[PDB]
Amino acid sequence: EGVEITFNVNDYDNTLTVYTTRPDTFMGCTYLAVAAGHPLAQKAAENNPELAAFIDECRNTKVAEAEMATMEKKGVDTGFKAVHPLTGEEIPVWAANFVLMEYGTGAVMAVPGHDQRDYEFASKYGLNIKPVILAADGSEPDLSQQALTEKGVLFNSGEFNGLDHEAAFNAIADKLTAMGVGERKV
């Protein structure tokens, strides 16, 4: 089971939609990443020559999902800001080479504290790494070297603090659904 989540973007006529099987980590989302070929990336390329160059480079490189663990991850800040719907804070939207258009929306929500691929991209570009899952012994996670991917009790997640994995999964999915910006997928 998973959740589709929709974000509004400042100064942009459309929304961004993301799919996640880890909605329990949602309060740790610190940026969004879109494919080189995403409409928002092309829109931003109009007033950004670095992005234009990045997009052309990605055009040549066909990256396969399964070969990505091995590939050099690359991205460019689009300068667009998405609003995190539960937090109300602006987060940057990056174009990245590892996000594809073929399967899915061409946009991902990044949680570098709790997703290893996200951790590596955020470390490389100096993006925020925000912890929202406690280590299994109940301590703050050690994020100094890598992401903590184990399901656990939430902290630093406002109203969802103290909830275990299944409770948090459901509570955040329900919150987003009631707000009209989330949809559970079978």
PDB file of C-alpha atoms in Angstrom:
ATOM      1  CA  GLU A   1       0.000   0.000   0.000  1.00  0.00           C
ATOM      2  CA  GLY A   2       1.151   3.549  -0.733  1.00  0.00           C
ATOM      3  CA  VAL A   3       0.010   7.168  -0.887  1.00  0.00           C
ATOM      4  CA  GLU A   4      -0.082   9.712  -3.732  1.00  0.00           C
ATOM      5  CA  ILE A   5       0.653  13.175  -2.377  1.00  0.00           C
ATOM      6  CA  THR A   6       0.134  16.498  -4.175  1.00  0.00           C
ATOM      7  CA  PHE A   7       2.159  19.669  -3.504  1.00  0.00           C
ATOM      8  CA  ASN A   8       1.454  23.252  -4.548  1.00  0.00           C
ATOM      9  CA  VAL A   9       4.420  25.149  -6.042  1.00  0.00           C
ATOM     10  CA  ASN A  10       4.945  28.924  -5.654  1.00  0.00           C
ATOM     11  CA  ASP A  11       4.726  30.857  -8.972  1.00  0.00           C
ATOM     12  CA  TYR A  12       3.838  27.776 -11.035  1.00  0.00           C
ATOM     13  CA  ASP A  13       0.496  27.025 -12.723  1.00  0.00           C
ATOM     14  CA  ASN A  14       0.453  23.319 -11.890  1.00  0.00           C
ATOM     15  CA  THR A  15       0.933  20.986  -8.914  1.00  0.00           C
ATOM     16  CA  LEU A  16       3.476  18.225  -8.329  1.00  0.00           C
ATOM     17  CA  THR A  17       2.339  14.707  -7.521  1.00  0.00           C
ATOM     18  CA  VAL A  18       4.526  12.162  -5.736  1.00  0.00           C
ATOM     19  CA  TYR A  19       4.036   8.451  -4.785  1.00  0.00           C
ATOM     20  CA  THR A  20       5.417   6.963  -1.537  1.00  0.00           C
ATOM     21  CA  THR A  21       5.211   3.679   0.402  1.00  0.00           C
ATOM     22  CA  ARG A  22       6.788   5.542   3.354  1.00  0.00           C
ATOM     23  CA  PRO A  23       4.234   8.257   4.254  1.00  0.00           C
ATOM     24  CA  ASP A  24       5.345   7.745   7.883  1.00  0.00           C
ATOM     25  CA  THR A  25       8.546   9.670   7.002  1.00  0.00           C
ATOM     26  CA  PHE A  26       6.627  12.583   5.454  1.00  0.00           C
ATOM     27  CA  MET A  27       7.583  15.206   8.078  1.00  0.00           C
ATOM     28  CA  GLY A  28      11.200  14.565   7.117  1.00  0.00           C
ATOM     29  CA  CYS A  29      10.613  15.566   3.481  1.00  0.00           C
ATOM     30  CA  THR A  30      13.114  18.386   2.843  1.00  0.00           C
ATOM     31  CA  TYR A  31      13.052  18.745  -0.955  1.00  0.00           C
ATOM     32  CA  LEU A  32      11.369  17.419  -4.065  1.00  0.00           C
ATOM     33  CA  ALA A  33      13.179  16.001  -7.093  1.00  0.00           C
ATOM     34  CA  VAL A  34      11.761  15.978 -10.620  1.00  0.00           C
ATOM     35  CA  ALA A  35      12.896  14.238 -13.819  1.00  0.00           C
ATOM     36  CA  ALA A  36      14.859  16.176 -16.462  1.00  0.00           C
ATOM     37  CA  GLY A  37      11.828  15.762 -18.727  1.00  0.00           C
ATOM     38  CA  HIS A  38       9.194  16.923 -16.209  1.00  0.00           C
ATOM     39  CA  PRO A  39       7.060  19.947 -17.270  1.00  0.00           C
ATOM     40  CA  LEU A  40       8.275  21.956 -14.227  1.00  0.00           C
ATOM     41  CA  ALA A  41      11.885  21.311 -15.247  1.00  0.00           C
ATOM     42  CA  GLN A  42      11.234  22.512 -18.828  1.00  0.00           C
ATOM     43  CA  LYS A  43       9.344  25.555 -17.491  1.00  0.00           C
ATOM     44  CA  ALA A  44      12.314  26.436 -15.233  1.00  0.00           C
ATOM     45  CA  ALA A  45      14.818  25.842 -18.059  1.00  0.00           C
ATOM     46  CA  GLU A  46      13.449  28.892 -19.923  1.00  0.00           C
ATOM     47  CA  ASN A  47      15.181  31.197 -17.399  1.00  0.00           C
ATOM     48  CA  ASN A  48      18.123  28.927 -16.424  1.00  0.00           C
ATOM     49  CA  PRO A  49      20.988  27.925 -18.784  1.00  0.00           C
ATOM     50  CA  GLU A  50      22.627  25.490 -16.316  1.00  0.00           C
ATOM     51  CA  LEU A  51      19.318  23.585 -16.226  1.00  0.00           C
ATOM     52  CA  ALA A  52      19.115  23.647 -20.037  1.00  0.00           C
ATOM     53  CA  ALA A  53      22.591  22.075 -20.123  1.00  0.00           C
ATOM     54  CA  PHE A  54      21.685  19.491 -17.426  1.00  0.00           C
ATOM     55  CA  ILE A  55      18.498  18.520 -19.314  1.00  0.00           C
ATOM     56  CA  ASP A  56      20.418  17.966 -22.573  1.00  0.00           C
ATOM     57  CA  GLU A  57      23.020  15.816 -20.776  1.00  0.00           C
ATOM     58  CA  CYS A  58      20.269  13.635 -19.261  1.00  0.00           C
ATOM     59  CA  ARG A  59      18.666  13.273 -22.718  1.00  0.00           C
ATOM     60  CA  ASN A  60      21.769  11.399 -23.885  1.00  0.00           C
ATOM     61  CA  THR A  61      22.138   9.218 -20.791  1.00  0.00           C
ATOM     62  CA  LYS A  62      19.404   6.616 -20.561  1.00  0.00           C
ATOM     63  CA  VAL A  63      19.618   5.509 -16.918  1.00  0.00           C
ATOM     64  CA  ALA A  64      18.002   2.210 -15.955  1.00  0.00           C
ATOM     65  CA  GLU A  65      16.406   1.911 -12.498  1.00  0.00           C
ATOM     66  CA  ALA A  66      18.532  -1.147 -11.744  1.00  0.00           C
ATOM     67  CA  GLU A  67      21.879   0.479 -12.707  1.00  0.00           C
ATOM     68  CA  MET A  68      21.366   3.552 -10.534  1.00  0.00           C
ATOM     69  CA  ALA A  69      23.034   2.309  -7.322  1.00  0.00           C
ATOM     70  CA  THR A  70      26.189   2.481  -9.454  1.00  0.00           C
ATOM     71  CA  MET A  71      25.645   5.821 -11.254  1.00  0.00           C
ATOM     72  CA  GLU A  72      26.874   9.305 -10.375  1.00  0.00           C
ATOM     73  CA  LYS A  73      23.835  11.175  -9.074  1.00  0.00           C
ATOM     74  CA  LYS A  74      23.511  14.707 -10.467  1.00  0.00           C
ATOM     75  CA  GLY A  75      21.070  17.566 -10.067  1.00  0.00           C
ATOM     76  CA  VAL A  76      20.314  21.263 -10.494  1.00  0.00           C
ATOM     77  CA  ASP A  77      18.184  23.490  -8.285  1.00  0.00           C
ATOM     78  CA  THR A  78      15.195  24.605 -10.396  1.00  0.00           C
ATOM     79  CA  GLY A  79      14.658  27.634  -8.158  1.00  0.00           C
ATOM     80  CA  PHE A  80      11.002  26.611  -7.709  1.00  0.00           C
ATOM     81  CA  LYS A  81       9.679  26.144  -4.141  1.00  0.00           C
ATOM     82  CA  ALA A  82       7.037  23.584  -3.168  1.00  0.00           C
ATOM     83  CA  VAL A  83       5.025  24.077   0.043  1.00  0.00           C
ATOM     84  CA  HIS A  84       5.117  21.060   2.396  1.00  0.00           C
ATOM     85  CA  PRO A  85       1.363  20.616   3.010  1.00  0.00           C
ATOM     86  CA  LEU A  86       1.534  19.637   6.720  1.00  0.00           C
ATOM     87  CA  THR A  87       4.352  21.894   7.735  1.00  0.00           C
ATOM     88  CA  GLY A  88       3.513  24.891   5.520  1.00  0.00           C
ATOM     89  CA  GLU A  89       7.242  25.468   4.916  1.00  0.00           C
ATOM     90  CA  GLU A  90       8.808  25.975   1.476  1.00  0.00           C
ATOM     91  CA  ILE A  91      11.134  23.269   0.197  1.00  0.00           C
ATOM     92  CA  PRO A  92      13.264  23.393  -2.973  1.00  0.00           C
ATOM     93  CA  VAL A  93      12.476  21.453  -6.108  1.00  0.00           C
ATOM     94  CA  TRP A  94      15.559  19.970  -7.747  1.00  0.00           C
ATOM     95  CA  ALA A  95      15.938  18.356 -11.155  1.00  0.00           C
ATOM     96  CA  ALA A  96      17.833  15.075 -10.774  1.00  0.00           C
ATOM     97  CA  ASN A  97      19.129  12.417 -13.189  1.00  0.00           C
ATOM     98  CA  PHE A  98      17.766   9.472 -11.174  1.00  0.00           C
ATOM     99  CA  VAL A  99      14.082  10.466 -11.458  1.00  0.00           C
ATOM    100  CA  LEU A 100      12.397   9.077 -14.575  1.00  0.00           C
ATOM    101  CA  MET A 101       9.187   9.814 -16.507  1.00  0.00           C
ATOM    102  CA  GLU A 102       8.319   6.322 -17.813  1.00  0.00           C
ATOM    103  CA  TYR A 103       6.769   4.695 -14.727  1.00  0.00           C
ATOM    104  CA  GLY A 104       5.191   7.162 -12.263  1.00  0.00           C
ATOM    105  CA  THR A 105       4.742  10.941 -12.052  1.00  0.00           C
ATOM    106  CA  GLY A 106       8.329  11.998 -12.720  1.00  0.00           C
ATOM    107  CA  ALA A 107       8.497  13.541  -9.240  1.00  0.00           C
ATOM    108  CA  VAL A 108       9.675  12.184  -5.892  1.00  0.00           C
ATOM    109  CA  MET A 109       9.528  13.403  -2.301  1.00  0.00           C
ATOM    110  CA  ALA A 110      12.976  13.175  -0.737  1.00  0.00           C
ATOM    111  CA  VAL A 111      13.581  12.192   2.895  1.00  0.00           C
ATOM    112  CA  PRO A 112      17.385  12.127   3.213  1.00  0.00           C
ATOM    113  CA  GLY A 113      17.296  11.119   6.909  1.00  0.00           C
ATOM    114  CA  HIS A 114      15.499   7.857   6.074  1.00  0.00           C
ATOM    115  CA  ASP A 115      16.115   6.991   2.440  1.00  0.00           C
ATOM    116  CA  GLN A 116      19.669   6.083   1.441  1.00  0.00           C
ATOM    117  CA  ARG A 117      19.539   7.392  -2.148  1.00  0.00           C
ATOM    118  CA  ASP A 118      18.086  10.660  -0.820  1.00  0.00           C
ATOM    119  CA  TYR A 119      20.836  10.791   1.857  1.00  0.00           C
ATOM    120  CA  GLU A 120      23.590  10.607  -0.791  1.00  0.00           C
ATOM    121  CA  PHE A 121      22.049  13.313  -3.059  1.00  0.00           C
ATOM    122  CA  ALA A 122      21.429  15.673  -0.110  1.00  0.00           C
ATOM    123  CA  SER A 123      24.976  15.130   1.217  1.00  0.00           C
ATOM    124  CA  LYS A 124      26.456  15.949  -2.211  1.00  0.00           C
ATOM    125  CA  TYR A 125      24.425  19.158  -2.661  1.00  0.00           C
ATOM    126  CA  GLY A 126      24.198  20.326   0.967  1.00  0.00           C
ATOM    127  CA  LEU A 127      20.438  19.810   1.334  1.00  0.00           C
ATOM    128  CA  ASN A 128      18.734  19.463   4.736  1.00  0.00           C
ATOM    129  CA  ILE A 129      18.893  16.036   6.390  1.00  0.00           C
ATOM    130  CA  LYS A 130      16.028  16.036   8.908  1.00  0.00           C
ATOM    131  CA  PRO A 131      15.501  13.097  11.315  1.00  0.00           C
ATOM    132  CA  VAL A 132      11.934  12.033  12.105  1.00  0.00           C
ATOM    133  CA  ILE A 133      12.342   8.331  13.012  1.00  0.00           C
ATOM    134  CA  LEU A 134      13.944   7.230  16.298  1.00  0.00           C
ATOM    135  CA  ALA A 135      16.519   4.412  16.376  1.00  0.00           C
ATOM    136  CA  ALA A 136      15.123   1.111  17.704  1.00  0.00           C
ATOM    137  CA  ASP A 137      16.519   1.686  21.216  1.00  0.00           C
ATOM    138  CA  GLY A 138      14.564   4.948  21.302  1.00  0.00           C
ATOM    139  CA  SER A 139      17.499   7.320  20.789  1.00  0.00           C
ATOM    140  CA  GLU A 140      17.905   9.974  18.107  1.00  0.00           C
ATOM    141  CA  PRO A 141      19.238   8.237  14.973  1.00  0.00           C
ATOM    142  CA  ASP A 142      22.930   8.372  14.048  1.00  0.00           C
ATOM    143  CA  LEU A 143      22.732  10.108  10.674  1.00  0.00           C
ATOM    144  CA  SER A 144      26.385  11.167  10.601  1.00  0.00           C
ATOM    145  CA  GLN A 145      27.275   8.510   7.998  1.00  0.00           C
ATOM    146  CA  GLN A 146      24.068   7.134   6.439  1.00  0.00           C
ATOM    147  CA  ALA A 147      20.255   7.181   6.466  1.00  0.00           C
ATOM    148  CA  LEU A 148      18.215   5.248   9.014  1.00  0.00           C
ATOM    149  CA  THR A 149      15.858   3.195   6.923  1.00  0.00           C
ATOM    150  CA  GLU A 150      14.313   1.002   9.658  1.00  0.00           C
ATOM    151  CA  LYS A 151      10.670   1.636  10.469  1.00  0.00           C
ATOM    152  CA  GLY A 152      10.331   3.111  13.967  1.00  0.00           C
ATOM    153  CA  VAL A 153       8.635   5.601  16.304  1.00  0.00           C
ATOM    154  CA  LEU A 154       8.277   9.137  15.004  1.00  0.00           C
ATOM    155  CA  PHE A 155       9.750  12.220  16.583  1.00  0.00           C
ATOM    156  CA  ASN A 156      10.268  15.795  15.333  1.00  0.00           C
ATOM    157  CA  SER A 157       7.009  15.232  13.417  1.00  0.00           C
ATOM    158  CA  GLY A 158       4.625  17.496  15.328  1.00  0.00           C
ATOM    159  CA  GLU A 159       1.225  15.900  15.905  1.00  0.00           C
ATOM    160  CA  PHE A 160       2.460  12.511  14.744  1.00  0.00           C
ATOM    161  CA  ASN A 161       5.195  12.241  17.411  1.00  0.00           C
ATOM    162  CA  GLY A 162       5.306   9.087  19.449  1.00  0.00           C
ATOM    163  CA  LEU A 163       3.374   7.067  16.869  1.00  0.00           C
ATOM    164  CA  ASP A 164       4.781   3.724  15.805  1.00  0.00           C
ATOM    165  CA  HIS A 165       5.149   2.803  12.138  1.00  0.00           C
ATOM    166  CA  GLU A 166       1.691   1.474  11.276  1.00  0.00           C
ATOM    167  CA  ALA A 167      -0.061   4.135  13.373  1.00  0.00           C
ATOM    168  CA  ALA A 168       2.014   6.881  11.720  1.00  0.00           C
ATOM    169  CA  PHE A 169       1.536   5.440   8.223  1.00  0.00           C
ATOM    170  CA  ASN A 170      -2.229   5.569   8.733  1.00  0.00           C
ATOM    171  CA  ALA A 171      -2.338   8.879  10.606  1.00  0.00           C
ATOM    172  CA  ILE A 172      -0.391  10.781   7.950  1.00  0.00           C
ATOM    173  CA  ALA A 173      -2.279   9.098   5.072  1.00  0.00           C
ATOM    174  CA  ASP A 174      -5.571  10.088   6.771  1.00  0.00           C
ATOM    175  CA  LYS A 175      -4.436  13.685   7.394  1.00  0.00           C
ATOM    176  CA  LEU A 176      -3.477  14.164   3.744  1.00  0.00           C
ATOM    177  CA  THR A 177      -6.672  12.487   2.516  1.00  0.00           C
ATOM    178  CA  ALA A 178      -8.874  14.756   4.690  1.00  0.00           C
ATOM    179  CA  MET A 179      -6.988  17.785   3.334  1.00  0.00           C
ATOM    180  CA  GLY A 180      -7.674  16.739  -0.273  1.00  0.00           C
ATOM    181  CA  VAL A 181      -3.992  16.256  -1.151  1.00  0.00           C
ATOM    182  CA  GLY A 182      -3.421  12.560  -0.482  1.00  0.00           C
ATOM    183  CA  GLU A 183      -4.830   9.375  -1.905  1.00  0.00           C
ATOM    184  CA  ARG A 184      -4.253   5.834  -0.729  1.00  0.00           C
ATOM    185  CA  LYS A 185      -3.431   3.499  -3.598  1.00  0.00           C
ATOM    186  CA  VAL A 186      -4.262  -0.229  -3.579  1.00  0.00           C
TER     187      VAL A 186
END
